[PDB]
Design a protein around this ligand. Sequence first.
Ligand SMILES: NC[C@@H]1O[C@H](O[C@H]2[C@@H](O)[C@H](O[C@@H]3[C@@H](O)[C@H](N)C[C@H](N)[C@H]3O[C@H]3O[C@H](CO)[C@@H](O)[C@H](O)[C@H]3N)O[C@@H]2CO)[C@H](N)[C@@H](O)[C@@H]1O
Lengths: 106, 256, 82, 129
Amino acid sequence: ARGLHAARKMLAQRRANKWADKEWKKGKLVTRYKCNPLGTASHAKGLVQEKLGIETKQPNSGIRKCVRVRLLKNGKKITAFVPRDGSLNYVNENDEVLISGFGRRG
Amino acid sequence: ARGPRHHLKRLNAPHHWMLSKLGGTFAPKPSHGPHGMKECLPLILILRNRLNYALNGREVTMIVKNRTIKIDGKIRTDTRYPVGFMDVLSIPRTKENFRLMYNTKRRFCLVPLTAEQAKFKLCKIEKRVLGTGAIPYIVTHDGRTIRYPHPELQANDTIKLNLETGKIVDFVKFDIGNTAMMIGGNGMGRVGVIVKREVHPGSFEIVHIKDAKGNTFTTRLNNVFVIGKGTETLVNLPLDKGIKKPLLQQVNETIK
Amino acid sequence: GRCLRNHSITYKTPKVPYERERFDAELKLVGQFGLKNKKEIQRVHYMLGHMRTIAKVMLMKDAKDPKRLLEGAALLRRLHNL
Amino acid sequence: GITRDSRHKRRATGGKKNSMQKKKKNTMGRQPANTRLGAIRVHDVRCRYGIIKRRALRLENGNFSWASQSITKGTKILNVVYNASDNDFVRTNTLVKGAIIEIDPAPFRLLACISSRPGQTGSVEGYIL
RNA sequence: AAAUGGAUUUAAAUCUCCUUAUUUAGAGGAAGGAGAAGUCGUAACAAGGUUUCCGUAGGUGAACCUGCGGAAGGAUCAU
RNA sequence: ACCUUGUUCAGAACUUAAAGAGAAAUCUUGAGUUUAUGGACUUCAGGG
RNA sequence: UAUCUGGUUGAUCCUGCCAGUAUUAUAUGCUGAUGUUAAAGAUUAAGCCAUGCAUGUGUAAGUAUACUGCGGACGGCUCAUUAUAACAGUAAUAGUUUCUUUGGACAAGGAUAGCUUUGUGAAUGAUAAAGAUAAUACUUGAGACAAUUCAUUCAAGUGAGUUAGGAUGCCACGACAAUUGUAGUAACCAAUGAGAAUUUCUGAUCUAUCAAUCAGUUGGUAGUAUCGAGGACUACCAAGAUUAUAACGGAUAACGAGGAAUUGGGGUUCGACAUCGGAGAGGGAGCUUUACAGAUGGCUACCACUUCUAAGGAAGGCAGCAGGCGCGUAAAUUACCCACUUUCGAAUUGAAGAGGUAGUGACGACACAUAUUGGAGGGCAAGUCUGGUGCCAGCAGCCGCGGUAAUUCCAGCUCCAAUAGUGUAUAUUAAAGUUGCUGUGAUUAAAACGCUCGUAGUUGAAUUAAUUACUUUGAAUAAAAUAAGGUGUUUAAAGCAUGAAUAUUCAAGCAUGGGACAAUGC
RNA sequence: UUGAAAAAAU
RNA sequence: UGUAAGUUAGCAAGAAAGAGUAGCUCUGGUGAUUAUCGAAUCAGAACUUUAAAGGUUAGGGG
Ligand SMILES: NC[C@@H]1O[C@H](O[C@H]2[C@@H](O)[C@H](O[C@@H]3[C@@H](O)[C@H](N)C[C@H](N)[C@H]3O[C@H]3O[C@H](CO)[C@@H](O)[C@H](O)[C@H]3N)O[C@@H]2CO)[C@H](N)[C@@H](O)[C@@H]1O
C-alpha cells in the first residue's frame, strides 16, 4: 500500500491495527468509568467491613493482614492491604480509610 | 453577541498602536468617524504616548474638552476622536503642530507641521457617483462629501484640498508617470514610482512600483495612495523619506 | 494557559540519576568554584545548549544565506563581548 | 414566532439537523395578511431597525396603469377573477401580486393583473393587458 | 381606548404506542479465576511402555478411548 | 519411433558453497539483493 | 544527551512483555529562613442558596417659584448543548443593514407630573381620587422639496447590469422643532462598515455488534413572509437528493480556533479557563421596550424549587463578586477604593465586586540564610557494623530477603542522592524500531485467507527536439505565544522600560516563471 | 506377557 | 396507513393501533365501430347540514 495516492488504506489500516494493544485500548473503552472501582480517582474513601488475612503465594509463606472496604461512591467491596507491621490494630470498624491503588499501574 | 461591541481588549487592538500587554485589560475604542477602526489612532493615545503631555488618560479629558486641539478646518472636543491618515493636527496653545504619518517600520509617526503648511490637507478619491439630480460627486478617503468637483476626475485619483475654503486646488491622475506612498501591509511606509499595473478581471488589480533608489516592490491597487506626479513630493515626507532599508543598517547601526 | 505574564525554567535534571562518572566530576566544579549546590551546573548546561543548537541550525545552510548573516553576526557579536 | 431559519430542515442527503441554540430574533416572521376586498383598512407594523411597513388587510381602491396611452387613474376593483398561485385565493377575493382581477373602466373609458405587494406596500397597483 | 366573545399562529404541560443509557431480581442457574503440604487414576514429555497431533462422530467419573481421512512438528531423508 | 550427444524453452526436484541472510535449526528456483531500511497489491499479529 | 537496566535457563542465543527511568498536571504524608512573580469550586453536582454589593446619569446650553433623554442589548460568569453544526483561513453581498460619530408667524391648541387634598393595606419597587401646574412629553401650525410604490422610456464607469442617474403618468409620508444659552429637530445621500447578519471553497475523534437513507424530501412556476437571497412557508408540477471516496445512525467523561505538555527528524496527548467566535442564565415555550434582546441582576403560562404572612395574599432566579449546605482525593476573604486601563452619562466632575490594592495560598517560576525525605542485596549510592524474631511477625513497584549465624524485618551507630525541598498514588510524553509513512514481523516464538474468479481501491512498459497536480516567487495574512533582534528590572525569572523586516498561515484560496515526472480524451 | 505412584519450600 | 415476541419459515394476523365514510352539483380514468353507442366501477373538487356503516346484517382485545 506504498502508493502515493493510497493514503486512505494506510490510515484505515492503522486505525484498525491500533485497537489490538492492551494498554491504549484501555484508554478508549468505557470501562474505567464503569468497572474500575476507583474510576479516574487517585484515592477512594470507604468503610471497613471485615478483617481478612491472605496467605502469600507458593514460594513464600505467611499471612498478609488485610481489610475488606466498602466504598462511599460506588458501594463495591475491595480488599485493602494494611500498610505496616502491626498496623492492623490502628484501623477500626466503621471508620474513614483512604484507598489509593498500588505500584503496578491500575 | 446581541449588538455592537464597546469594550476593546488590550490585545485585540491593532499592533501599530504602540500599546503594551500588561498595562491594563482594555484599550480605548475609537468612535465612528472619518477613518476605520484599525486604520486610525485614537486621539487619547496621541496625547499620552507620542506627546507624553499627560501622565494618565484622565488628564486627556482636561485638554480636549477645553477646545484646545484643532484638526482639519474645525476644532473637536472628543477624547477618543479617530485620527487616521495624514490629516493635519494643530495645537495652538503649545505653538506646535504635527502630522500623523506612516513609516517604513510599520508604525504611526508624527512629522511636525509649520503654520504655513497646515492650511491644507491631501485627500484620496474613493469613488465617483452620479447622485440624484444629475449631480456627480466623489467620496474621499476621510469620508468627506464634497460638492461639484472637476469633471475630469476619476475614482482613483487624488485631490489637493483646502481646509478653510473647502475647494479643490490641484488634481494628480493615476497613471504610469507618477509617485505614490503606501498605506498597505508589508508595503506600507514605502514610497516609490509606479512602473506597471496589471489588471486581473477576476478579483484584483496589481501594480508594480519602483523605489527612488531602484528597489522594486509589489502591492495591491487598494493600497496605492498617489503623493505626486513625476517624482515630485507634494507634502513633507517623514524623517526616513519612506525608503525601505534592506535591514543592513538596522542591526549593525543600532549597536553603536 | 492561565496568566499573561511569561515564565521560564533554567535547570533540567539529568536523565540518569546515579552515575559515578558524573558524581566525581560534579565536585571538581563545585569545590573549585565554591558553589552551593548542583543547581548551577545544570543552569550553565542549559546556557551552552541554548546557543549550541542556534549555531547548529544556521551552520547547515550556505554562507550566502541572508538569515545566516543576520542572526549569525548577532550571535557571534553577542558571544564575543561576553 | 414563525422562524425562517434553516435549522429545522434536513440536509441534502436526508440527514436530520441537531439543535445547538434556541430561536433567534433575527429570524422574525409574521402571519400573512391576505388583502381581501372591503373598506380601506391598512395597519402599520413596526419592522426591524425601526422601519414601518404599511400592513393592509382590505382595500377597495387601487391606482392602476395602462402604458399604451400612459394614463394612471385609480378605480374601484369589483372582484378577483383568477390567481396563478392558488385556486382557493379566487373565492376569498384576496389581493396578491400576479393575480388577474376585473374592474370597471369608468375613468379608463371616459382584466387587470396586480403588480404590487399590498401586504407590504399597503396599496394596490396594476396594469391592463 | 379598558373588560369580554370568536377564529388563526407559535405552542408550554400531560395521557397512549415507539429506541438508547443506568439500575433492583432472593438463595436462583450455568461459566471462569485465584489459594504450600486434601482424594481417584497415568492421559502427555524416552518407541512414556497403544507414536503424537488435526478435523469430524459416538461413548465414558476422570484424564481419555475408538471409527474415517490427513500431518511429521516421527522413531524412516536410505535398498 | 526407441537408444548416445550438443544448443535452447517450460516443469517437479537434488549435491557443494570458504559466499549472502538468520537468534539458531536452516534457506540459495530465497527465508539473498535490509539500520547501506521505499518494485506494485491483499490478508493477518501484538506477553500468557 | 538520536542513551538503557533487572526479570523465563545449569548456562547461552532470540521474540516477548513486567518493573525500573526522566518530564508535565492532580491529590496527599514530612519539613518549611527570606525577596520577586503567580494558579486557585471544572472534572463527582449547568446541584441547591440565608445574606451584602454589583447600572446609573444634571452642563451655562430640554422642563424648575419630579417630568423628559440615554444606558442597563456593554461589561462580567459557566461550558449544558452541539459531528459539516460551530470554528479557522478565504471569497460574495451586482442578495441586506441600523445605533453612535463624521461630511453634505414678536408664537398656536391643549392635560399629564412635582407639591399637596382625603386615604386604603400586614405586607409587595403596594396601590385610590379629588386642584392646578411646564416641555426638546403630545398634536398643530407653516415658513419651501426630498425619498418610497407602480406601468413606460434616454440609455455610461463597471471583469460583468434596461445599472448609479435623467425623463414621464401617478400614489403616498411630507419636512429645515412655534428649539434652549447670558447648542436642539425632521428626513435623504455617503463614510465609519475589512463592522453586524446571511453565504462560496477547504479542513474534525472513535464506530459497520450502524448498509442503504430522505417525502418539504430534490428542483421548477407563482405568490406570501422577512431589513434582506432562498422550500423559509404556501398552491401546482416532475421524481428527484445522498450512498463503499463510508450516506443515514451511535458514543464522548466534544464548545471550536490562536495554542499547551513532550519531542533527533517524524510524531503522540491536552485545550472549560488570558484573546477571538459560539451557546446558556433551574427546563423548554410565548412576548414587551428599543437601533441591535427571543433580554431572564425584563414580563407571562406551565413543571420543580425558595422567602414573608395578620391565613386574605406577596416575589425570587448568586452558571456575577464574597460567603453557606451537599458533592467529593480535589480548590481562597461574607475587605477597601474608582488611584492606574476602560466603559456608560443630561457629558472636564456622577457610576462600575469591570479594574486596582490588601488576605489565604508548598499548583507552579527566578535569586537565595544555615533541614528534612527516602535508602544502604541487583537495576541504583551507600555498611563483608550488633540485639531480637525463627517461613511466624514482616520488608519487597520487579528479581527476592526471613524455617534459630537475616548484606533487605523490627531496632542502636555511620553515609548516599536531592535540598526548601522530598516520598507516595493516578494520568500525558520519550524510551516504544512494543502501533512501525520515516519504522516492525508472518517456516519454527503471535500471526499468509484451503484455492481460484471478481467490482470498488491501489499500482500500471517504451516513444513526441486545455485544465489539475508539482515546483519557484510574491500579495494579503488579530493580538498573546513559539525562536528571538535590541534593552545590566543589581544578574536571572521578569518588563518593553527604539517596538527587531520580527519568520510563522499546516490545510485551503489569489496572480506568476518551468514542464522532467504525473491524472483527465480528441 | 505384566511393570502404577514418589507431599510444599530451601 | 401500520402491524411485535415466537415460529415447523408455511404461519402468528382481521395481530395490536390510527385516519376516512352523509347530501347536492360537477370533473377525470377504464371500450366497440368509423362523431355515434354501451357497462357499472375507481379517483378527485367545490357547496350545505342535525359531521354521516350502524333501521336490518354485523370480530371484544391482550
Ligand atoms: N486453574 C483452573 C483449572 O484448574 C484445574 O485444576 C485445579 C484443581 O483441580 C487443582 O487442584 C490441585 C490437585 O490437582 C492436586 N492433586 C492437589 C492440590 N492440593 C490441588 O490444589 C488446589 O487445591 C488446594 C486445596 O487446598 C489449594 O491449596 C491449592 O492452592 C490449589 N491449587 O488445582 C487447580 C486449581 O485449583 C486444572 N489445573 C486446569 O483445568 C485449570 O488450571
